[PDB]
């Protein structure tokens, strides 16, 4: 969920995603893992049959019939993965997933204890301001005037210096 | 010194005093019907001066 | 099989207008991508901008609020079906409720004048 | 009564001459002393009403408002002590003086007998409010808001005055309880009907119906915490008190001079409670809720039943306090952010762990969770309206439901989601604002405990 | 006559004490969960005494502790009615809550705000005890709404589980839709009898008194689970299992039925209610049993089972066996709670996988919870002597023995079968097939705080039903004269359910590929009723609240009408009266017109 | 009843266990960087089924955006480590 | 506690017939309670009552002299009207409290009679219906601005109707 997708897609990924979805819904239909393996092998054969074909006509036709068959023979109540959407743990801990900047407003009587950890925050923030302005020119120099960009982010082409825009990713709290 | 600062705390008490005094003056007015009513008409027992 | 609806839209895959391979449509998609990437980058140059002591302003949010709150009467132009729906909502239901209440009260009044309606225990009212 | 007023007339020069470092604390504590002394009125041993002169008086229906006002003064002060912090000492002193003048006027009017004195005070309430709203707002439309406020109020004021004159001439005097002991009945013609109108129209325009609820949101939004407080708490209540004290004469007209107003009040309660669902602006939501409850107040005032009057007073006091509290909370969340919008700040309760329990304890009092004077009033009023007709429980219930809905919608779009990540300006709770919340709440507890004080004329 | 009230107030004082401690500063030093658990234990030991004195005297009691107000011939006061119902419900609820508190103390480690959780639980408990042992309908409304809000909070304890917020909103909406009819009843009684108390209401045993009964009926349908307003019970499961049990196995749902039964005296002289209590409660024994055949979530299945049992009890009420209904509440609570307890143990042992579809071999890998789960499953089926029988089978006697509507009887028996059906479904999919769960394993159940509670609850679920059925005063007159095919119907039909479930679960194998059939899809999707209701009703209501009211009335017309009209009008008149140019040649002509006017007016008027 | 967290050695041993129990093409000797499509001549089907087996082995789910791009056991492990925040 | 006001019917207590070979728990239970709890409480109560008696204080009951009524009260004049209306408010309040007393005694009778409330709990219901017809014919449709004048108009209209009925 960190990297971002492209605008358009390709037949390749479309078919892959249909495959994974159908196999999950089959794991849900047919509970026993033996039956799941059996029917998964059957679906694999169904695919490998038309695999080598390349004609966009047959591609689109088979794909749009496959999606209809899938939507018409899918599982009403599928198998959701707890830690992912739909489950019974999604966001369950966000009520505890506080960010860091709540720290600054601590009271000194409290950060009195936990002294070591606060002895290292400064040298971390210090690791941010000293290398921020540079992280901008790396883009404002490479902000290709062509003006056709994606959401990707280039690394530190230099050594020693840090990458650009690491704050909103580093310091992201645990999952617990 | 300090009274120029710590005297202001005398007004409000003086205002309350003045208020109670003004209400006392009003109630001393309207003294009519002191005991002429028809539901609290006493005999003015001895040594018990008027309300 | 399946049909669309105002609630259960036609899901992503099945949409015939998807799977299109038009160069113009793909170019539109990539333009949307350029836009969205510029936006996210301008946003991330502030989410992490150090020396910051404040929050971010959401101008989309502000404009949405403006359009829901105060841009209404100026761009408002009265027309029929609009005046009509307004007069309806402002008159009809009040008058329906009113006929109801008046009929009920007159029933109660004539009943009592006859001297019938059992009012025992209606001591507090 | 002078014992309540004179000190409130001394807080002014006190404020003027006191030094900056000390005026706040001095005036605050002394206003609290005034609030304390304001309880002498509660020594209502027997039923003989209190009368201090031909110029003042008290009553069970007025005393609550008096104490509530003398106790909302200092809360306005305190809630007005973090903003205008970079405004000059003279300006903040002006602000204090305006607040105090409001207090004094409200006391004198809720006490006075002669409705003409009541009226001049009811109309002098404006100047301080208009000023507070124009000279200390935070947006630009505050001007139009003040204009609407003023002119609605004065349009109401005029025919009220004309009818007071007609009365003072036909009848000999205007003093209350004399109006009672020498009232009479009217031939019930168009003349007396338009008289009923010219007498109630102002009080209604103030206590908003569906038709004229327009100046409330603009005020409560463009205006600051203190103006919002005082509006939602008292400047509405003035209309209710006037109507109660004056309807004593217009019998029987108010049997058939009510159907339109009752209908409007109920329908407006419903439509405004609905809008409270989809109204972004938090303070606007609160204002429309206030409209929804004052509609109940009005429907209970008209039909003139004792249960109805006691429920009206209960709900009146309850809403006053609860709305002041909700507005404190809104302001609080605003000073840290500077945007009224509900959907911007979300998923709190991870950094303001306590404050929530000052958010919660308000909603529960809005949606009529018992045991609360709120529900007692709503319920007695629903009883009176059921007696007056069997087909009003419908609207009572629709309103109850939509309230139970939007109160929680408000709780959940500000204290139930997941925390944003660009609101670094979340200065933790101030002891001051926590104190304001606690002070708005605790009296609700004590009155839920012993409400015999807060009943009304009939009890 | 002094020990009694002493105990009845002491239990409330005990439950208060922790809450008070919550205010104080000791919690950071003290084990609040154990504190509260033990206070609850002693509250139960206290509550027991009333039971002994009551079975030994059968003397009900009525009390008026505190006088609140005097509102002009309609007073108010904290009045209790310690009769069979409440004096027994207190003991049952505490016997359950002690175990639940131990289970929580064990199940919610690694969570910081556990003391907060405990305080919330005991607050709900106080409110429910109030509702139970209360007499004034006002006190009862207090209990009602306090229970509602406590359930809201508890479903939302994890205030990031987005759908949990919506579940809580569902709950509040439906509980308010019940409160509507409840206030209706309060008002009707305060008018037609001047009082709110059951004592002075019993004298309505002669009149039509139908509107308040409809009100209490809607209140039941709301706070409990019935046809129109069940959908809020399955979603609560999004919350934790301890509360999903306490607040949704023996409390917050039995409240409506408790109310109806306390109001039974007026329900024996209304032959309409007696009927509508069957076309409303028996139906739910079908519209949920259906949904209790394909649902995979343990908690959802259990909740649908609970709705089924509650519909059954509303049915027996309709046909006038209220003490039977109450006994069934009591018994039902025990095992319907032990099931959620075992399920929570299972889950916490695993990585938060409610789904049966990813568990198995539970017997071997975990004998204790499986034995207890089988106990509960068979008890709910109606095993002859497991505290289920002692109410369920008398109920199934009466249902066929009385003049009960045909379709109602029929779907009720069908549901009595579907009980065994989905019970054996649990059994098979969780306890008899292969271990389809992940490879890693960190099982642990040898902890006492989780092994003792289930033990106590099993002893209870096995004994208390019998004990009560033999110790309570024989309220009603039974019917013990019928054929065997009507005295043993529940037994026979549950055995049928066992056989059928075995056949079908074994058919699940054999490589018999599945097919999305509409009956089963319906069952799984609840019947599409939520899928349409919660997707049109909100949309239309909100779109109306926006289009008509906000814009088309409160921002457009009520402004274009009064203020903007006045503005335009005065503006135009001012434009006119100051469009004047400075020309005397014109001003004087105007003066002349005015002079003419005045002369003519005087001439006419003489 | 919480078991202990996951470490890199455990993750690596498990992943090798699974990719070895695999039968299609793996010659039972997988280099940590034994590229699937390049260094083992695998198929997209096989890679996707591997990702799915890993999802089942670790409970959670891997989104498509990264399932399609994972082409190294070391990359899978780096992903899991940056998702569960291991190795304090 | 005026028992003539609150009846408190007798208490036909039953007798103990413990025919078994097992001991009554209540015996020992209530014995231990009455032992440990009532002893200190009773001693403390005696202490408090002794302090009371040594520093005793009395207080009387306010007796409001009577006055003329609205009838013998000329219109326009007020003083009389006030001294009548307040007396009337007192009477109104007293009647309301009487209603409360009736209702309390009624609920008592009901519970104390248990399931036989339909037979033995019918006497008090008659007092109730009678008292309530009175309170109705007196204070039913006045209005929150109720007062002696409106009550008198009610009485007078009712008298006129009854008299027209009698004459025909
Ligand atoms: C009447 C019958 C109706 C009963 C129904 C009640 C509904 C319950 C609503 C509710 O749970 O309120 C939240 C409230 C607790 O909220 P919370 O978020 O869990 O508090 C945690 C604090 O943030 C953090 O904990 P803390 O350190 O602040 O705890 C010490 C305590 C200290 O409180 C005090 O000392 C103030 C004393 C005045 O402060 C509070 O907990 C909040 C006050 O419930 C209470 O415990 C208050 C007393 C409950 C009795 C009813 C109070 C009126 C409602
Ligand atoms: C006008 C009010 C609206 C204005 C709000 C601002 C308020 C500021 C002014 C000061 C605070 C308000 C004063 C409230 C008085 C509290 C009354 C009280 O303590 O309750 C009295 C109660 C005795 O009960 P009581 O109702 O008097 O008689 C029935 C028989 N039990 O005894 C108790 O049990 C009290 C419990 C205390 C704990």
From Swiss-Prot, chain A:
Pfam families: Complex1_LYR. Its main location: mitochondrion. The keyword Ubl conjugation does not apply. It is found in: Mitochondrion inner membrane. The modification N-acetylalanine is found at residue 1. Belongs to the complex I LYR family. Mammalian complex I is composed of 45 different subunits. The keyword Acetylation applies. It comes from Mus musculus. It is a peripheral membrane protein. Keywords: Acetylation, Electron transport, Membrane, Mitochondrion, Mitochondrion inner membrane, Phosphoprotein, Respiratory chain, Transport. One of its GO terms (cellular component) is mitochondrion. One of its GO terms (biological process) is mitochondrial electron transport, NADH to ubiquinone. The modification Phosphoserine is found at residue 84. Accessory subunit of the mitochondrial membrane respiratory chain NADH dehydrogenase (Complex I), that is believed to be not involved in catalysis. Complex I functions in the transfer of electrons from NADH to the respiratory chain. The immediate electron acceptor for the enzyme is believed to be ubiquinone. This is NADH dehydrogenase [ubiquinone] 1 beta subcomplex subunit 9.
From Swiss-Prot, chain C:
This is NADH dehydrogenase [ubiquinone] 1 beta subcomplex subunit 4. PANTHER family: NADH DEHYDROGENASE [UBIQUINONE] 1 BETA SUBCOMPLEX SUBUNIT 4, NADH-UBIQUINONE OXIDOREDUCTASE B15 SUBUNIT. The keyword Methyltransferase does not apply. The chain crosses the membrane at residues 84-101. Belongs to the complex I NDUFB4 subunit family. The modification Phosphoserine is found at residue 22. It is found in: Mitochondrion inner membrane. The lineage of its organism: Eukaryota, Metazoa, Chordata, Craniata, Vertebrata. GO terms for cellular component: mitochondrial inner membrane; mitochondrion; nucleoplasm; respiratory chain complex I. It comes from Mus musculus. Keywords: Acetylation, Electron transport, Membrane, Mitochondrion, Mitochondrion inner membrane, Phosphoprotein, Respiratory chain, Transmembrane, Transmembrane helix, Transport.
From Swiss-Prot, chain D:
Keywords: Electron transport, Membrane, Mitochondrion, Mitochondrion inner membrane, NAD, Respiratory chain, Translocase, Transmembrane, Transmembrane helix, Transport, Ubiquinone. It is an enzyme of class 7 (translocase). The chain crosses the membrane at residues 23-43, 60-80, 90-110, 113-133, 147-167, 194-214, 224-244, 257-277, 284-303, 308-330, 350-370, 392-412, 434-454. GO terms for biological process: aerobic respiration; cerebellum development; in utero embryonic development; mitochondrial electron transport, NADH to ubiquinone; mitochondrial respiratory chain complex I assembly; proton motive force-driven mitochondrial ATP synthesis; response to ethanol; response to hypoxia. It catalyses: a ubiquinone + NADH + 5 H(+)(in) = a ubiquinol + NAD(+) + 4 H(+)(out). It holds the Pfam family Proton_antipo_M. The keyword Electron transport applies. It is a multi-pass membrane protein. One of its GO terms (cellular component) is mitochondrial inner membrane. It is found in: Mitochondrion inner membrane. GO terms for molecular function: NADH dehydrogenase (ubiquinone) activity. NCBIfam families: NDH_I_M. Core subunit of respiratory chain NADH dehydrogenase (Complex I) which is composed of 45 different subunits. The gene is Mtnd4. Core subunit of the mitochondrial membrane respiratory chain NADH dehydrogenase (Complex I) which catalyzes electron transfer from NADH through the respiratory chain, using ubiquinone as an electron acceptor. Essential for the catalytic activity and assembly of complex I. This is NADH-ubiquinone oxidoreductase chain 4.
From Swiss-Prot, chain G:
Keywords: Electron transport, Membrane, Mitochondrion, Mitochondrion inner membrane, Phosphoprotein, Respiratory chain, Transport. One of its GO terms (biological process) is proton motive force-driven mitochondrial ATP synthesis. Residues 1-23 are annotated as: Disordered. It comes from the Eukaryota. It is found in: Mitochondrion inner membrane. Complex I is composed of 45 different subunits. Interacts with CHCHD4. This is NADH dehydrogenase [ubiquinone] 1 beta subcomplex subunit 10. It comes from Mus musculus (Mouse). The lineage of its organism: Eukaryota, Metazoa, Chordata, Craniata, Vertebrata. The gene is Ndufb10.
């Amino acid at each position: 969920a960190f990297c971002a997708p492209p605008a358009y897609l390709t037949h390749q990924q479309k078919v892959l995603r249909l495959y994974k979805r159908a196999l999950r819904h089959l794991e849900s239909w047919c509970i026993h893992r033996d039956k799941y393996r059996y029917f998964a092998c059957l679906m694999r054969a169904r695919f490998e049959e038309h695999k080598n074909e390349k004609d966009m006509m047959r591609a689109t036709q088979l794909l749009r019939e496959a999606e209809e068959e899938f939507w018409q023979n899918q599982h009403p109540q599928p198998y959701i993965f707890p830690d992912s959407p739909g489950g019974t743990s999604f966001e369950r801990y966000e009520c505890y997933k506080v960010p860091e900047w709540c720290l600054d407003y601590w009271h000194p009587s409290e950060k009195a204890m936990y002294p070591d950890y606060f002895s290292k925050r400064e040298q971390w923030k210090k690791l941010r301001m000293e290398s921020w302005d540079r992280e901008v020119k790396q883009l404002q120099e490479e902000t290709s005037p062509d003006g056709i960009m994606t959401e990707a982010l280039p690394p530190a082409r230099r050594e020693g210096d840090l990458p650009p825009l690491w704050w909103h990713i580093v310091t992201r709290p645990r999952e617990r | 010194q300090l009274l120029r600062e710590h005297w202001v705390h005398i007004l409000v008490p003086a205002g309350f005093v003045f208020g109670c005094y003004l209400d006392r003056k009003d109630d001393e007015k309207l003294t009519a019907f002191r005991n002429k009513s028809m539901l609290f008409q006493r005999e003015l027992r001895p040594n018990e001066e008027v309300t | 099989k399946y049909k669309p609806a105002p609630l259960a839209t036609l899901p992503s895959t099945l949409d015939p207008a998807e799977y299109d391979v038009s160069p113009e449509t793909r170019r539109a998609q990539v333009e949307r991508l350029s836009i969205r990437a510029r936006l996210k980058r301008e946003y991330l140059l502030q989410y992490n901008d150090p020396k910051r002591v404040s929050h971010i302003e959401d101008p989309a949010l502000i404009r949405w609020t403006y359009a829901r709150s105060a841009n209404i009467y100026p761009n408002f132009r009265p027309t029929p079906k609009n005046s009509l729906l307004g007069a309806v909502a402002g008159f009809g239901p009040l008058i329906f409720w009113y006929y109801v209440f008046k009929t009920d009260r007159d029933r109660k009044e004539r009943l009592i004048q006859e001297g019938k309606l059992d009012r025992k225990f209606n001591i507090s009212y | 009564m002078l014992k309540i007023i004179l000190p409130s007339l001394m807080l002014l020069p006190l404020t003027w001459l006191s030094s900056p470092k000390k005026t706040w604390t001095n005036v605050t504590s002394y206003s609290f002393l005034i609030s304390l002394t304001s309880l002498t009125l509660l020594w209502q041993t027997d039923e003989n009403y209190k009368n201090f002169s031909n110029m003042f008086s008290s009553d069970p229906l007025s005393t609550p408002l008096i104490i509530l006002t003398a106790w909302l003064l200092p809360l306005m002060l305190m809630a007005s002590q973090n903003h205008l912090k970079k405004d000059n000492n003279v300006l903040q002193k002006l602000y204090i003086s305006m607040l105090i003048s409001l207090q004094i006027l409200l006391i004198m009017t809720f006490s006075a007998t002669e409705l003409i004195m009541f009226y001049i005070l009811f109309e002098a309430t404006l100047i301080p409010t208009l000023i507070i709203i124009t000279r200390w707002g935070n947006q630009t439309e505050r001007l139009n808001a003040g204009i609407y406020f003023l002119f609605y109020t004065l349009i109401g004021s005029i025919p009220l005055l004309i009818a007071l004159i007609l009365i003072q001439n036909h009848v000999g005097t205007l003093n209350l309880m004399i109006l009672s002991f020498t009232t009479h009945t009217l031939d019930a013609s168009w003349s007396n009907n338009l008289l009923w109108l010219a007498c109630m129209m102002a009080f209604l325009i103030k206590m908003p119906l569906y038709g004229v609820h327009l100046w409330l949101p603009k005020a409560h939004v463009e205006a600051p915490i203190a103006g919002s407080m005082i509006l939602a708490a008292i400047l509405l209540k003035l209309g209710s008190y006037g109507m109660i004290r004056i309807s004593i004469i217009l019998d029987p007209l108010t049997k058939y001079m009510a159907y339109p107003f009752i209908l409007l009040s109920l329908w407006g309660m419903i439509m405004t409670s609905s809008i409270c669902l989809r109204q972004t602006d938090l303070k606007s939501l609160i204002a429309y809720s206030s409209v929804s409850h004052m509609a109940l107040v009005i429907a209970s005032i008209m039909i003139q039943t004792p249960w109805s009057f006691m429920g009206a007073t209960m709900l009146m006091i309850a809403h006053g306090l609860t709305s002041s509290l909700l507005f404190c909370l809104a302001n609080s969340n605003y000073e840290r952010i500077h945007s009224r919008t509900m959907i911007m700040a979300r998923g709190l309760q991870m950094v303001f762990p306590l404050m929530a329990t000052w958010w919660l304890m308000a909603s529960l009092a809005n949606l009529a969770l018992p045991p609360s004077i709120n529900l007692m009033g709503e319920l007695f009023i629903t009883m009176s309206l059921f007696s007056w007709s069997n087909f009003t429980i419908i609207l009572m219930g629709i309103n109850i439901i939509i309230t139970g809905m939007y109160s929680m919608y408000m709780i959940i779009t500000t204290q139930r989601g997941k925390l944003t990540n660009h609101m670094i300006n979340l200065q933790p709770s101030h002891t001051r604002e926590l104190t304001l919340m606690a002070l708005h709440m605790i009296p609700l507890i004590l009155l839920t405990t012993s409400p015999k004080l807060i009943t009304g004329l009939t009890m | 006559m002094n020990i009694f009230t002493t105990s009845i107030l002491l239990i409330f004082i005990l439950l208060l004490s922790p809450i008070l401690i919550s205010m104080s500063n000791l919690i950071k030093h003290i084990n609040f969960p154990l504190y509260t658990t033990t206070s609850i234990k002693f509250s139960f030991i206290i509550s027991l005494l009333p039971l002994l004195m009551f079975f030994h005297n059968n003397m009900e009691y009525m009390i008026t502790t505190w006088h609140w107000v005097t509102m002009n011939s309609m007073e108010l006061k904290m009045s209790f009615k310690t009769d069979f119902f409440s004096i027994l419900f207190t003991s049952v609820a505490l016997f359950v809550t002690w175990s639940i508190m131990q289970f929580s103390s064990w199940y919610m480690h690694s969570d910081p705000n556990i003391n907060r959780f405990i305080k919330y639980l005991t607050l709900f408990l106080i409110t429910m005890l109030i509702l139970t042992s209360a007499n004034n309908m006002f006190q009862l409304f207090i209990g009602w709404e306090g229970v509602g809000i406590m359930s809201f909070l508890l479903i939302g304890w994890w205030y990031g589980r987005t759908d949990a917020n919506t579940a809580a909103l569902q709950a509040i909406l439906y509980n308010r839709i019940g409160d509507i009819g409840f206030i209706l009843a309060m008002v009707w009684f305060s008018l037609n009898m001047n009082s709110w108390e059951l004592q002075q209401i019993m004298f309505s045993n002669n009149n039509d008194n139908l509107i308040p009964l409809m009100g209490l009926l809607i209140a039941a349908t709301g706070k409990s689970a019935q046809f129109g307003l069940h959908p809020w019970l399955p979603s609560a499961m999004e919350g934790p299992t301890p509360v999903s049990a306490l607040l949704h196995s023996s409390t917050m749902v039995v409240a409506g039925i408790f109310l109806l039964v306390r109001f039974h005296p007026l329900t024996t002289n209304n032959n309409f209610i007696l009927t509508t209590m069957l076309c409303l409660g028996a139906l739910t024994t079908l519209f949920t049993a259906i949904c209790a055949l394909t649902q995979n979530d343990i908690k959802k299945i259990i909740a649908f089972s609970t709705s089924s049992q509650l519909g059954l009890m509303m049915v027996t009420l309709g046909m006038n066996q209220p003490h039977l209904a109450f006994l069934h509440i009591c018994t039902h609570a025990f095992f319907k709670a032990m099931l959620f307890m075992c399920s929570g143990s299972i889950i916490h042992s695993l990585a938060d996988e409610q789904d049966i579809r990813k568990m198995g071999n539970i017997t071997k890998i975990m004998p204790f919870t499986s034995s207890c789960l089988v106990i509960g499953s068979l008890a709910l089926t109606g095993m002859p002597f497991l505290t289920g029988f002692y109410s369920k089978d008398l109920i199934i006697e009466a249902i066929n023995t009385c003049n009960t509507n045909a379709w109602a009887l029929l779907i009720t028996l069908i549901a009595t079968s579907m009980t065994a059906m989905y019970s054996m479904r649990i059994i098979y999919f969780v306890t008899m097939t292969k271990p389809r769960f992940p490879p890693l394993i960190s099982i642990n159940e040898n902890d006492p705080d989780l092994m003792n509670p289930i033990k106590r609850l099993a002893f209870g679920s096995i004994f208390a039903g019998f004990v009560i059925s033999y110790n309570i005063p024989p309220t009603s007159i039974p019917v013990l004269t019928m054929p065997w095919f009507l005295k043993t119907t529940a037994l026979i039909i549950s055995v049928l359910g066992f056989l059928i479930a075995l056949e079908l679960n074994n058919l699940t194998m054999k490589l018999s590929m599945n097919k999305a059939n509409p009956y089963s899809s319906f069952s799984t999707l609840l019947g599409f009723f939520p899928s349409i209701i919660h997707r049109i009703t909100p949309m239309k209501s909100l779109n109306l609240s926006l289009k008509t009211s906000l814009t088309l009335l409160d921002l457009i017309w009520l402004e274009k009408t009064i203020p903007k009209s006045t503005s335009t009008l005065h503006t135009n008149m001012t434009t006119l009266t100051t469009n004047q140019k400075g020309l005397i040649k014109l001003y004087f002509m105007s003066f002349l017109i005015n002079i003419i006017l005045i002369i003519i007016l005087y001439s006419i008027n003489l | 009843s919480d078991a202990p967290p996951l470490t890199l050695d455990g993750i690596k041993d498990r992943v090798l266990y699974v990719l070895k129990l695999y039968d299609k093409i793996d010659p039972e000797k997988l280099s940590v960087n034994s590229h699937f499509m390049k260094d083992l001549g695998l198929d997209s089907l096989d890679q996707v089924e591997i990702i799915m087996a890993m999802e089942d082995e670790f409970g959670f789910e891997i989104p498509d955006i990264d399932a399609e791009k994972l082409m190294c056991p070391q990359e899978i492990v780096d992903y899991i480590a940056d998702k569960k925040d291991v190795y304090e | 506690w005026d028992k003539d006001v609150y009846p408190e019917p007798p208490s036909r207590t039953p007798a103990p017939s413990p025919q078994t070979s097992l001991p009554n728990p209540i015996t020992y239970l209530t014995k231990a309670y009455d032992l440990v709890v009532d002893w200190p409480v009773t001693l403390v109560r005696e202490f408090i009552e002794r302090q009371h008696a040594k520093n005793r204080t009395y207080y009387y009951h306010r007796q409001y002299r009577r006055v003329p009524d609205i009838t013998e009260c000329k219109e326009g004049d007020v003083l009389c009207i006030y001294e009548a209306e307040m007396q009337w408010r007192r009477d109104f309040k007293v009647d309301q409290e009487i209603m409360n007393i009736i209702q309390e005694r009624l609920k008592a009778c009901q519970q104390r009679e248990g399931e036989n409330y339909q037979q033995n709990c019918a006497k008090e219901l008659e007092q109730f219906t009678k008292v309530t017809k009175a309170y109705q014919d007196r204070y039913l449709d006045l209005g929150a601005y109720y007062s002696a004048r409106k009550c008198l108009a009610k009485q007078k209209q009712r008298m006129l109707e009854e008299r027209k009925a009698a004459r025909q």
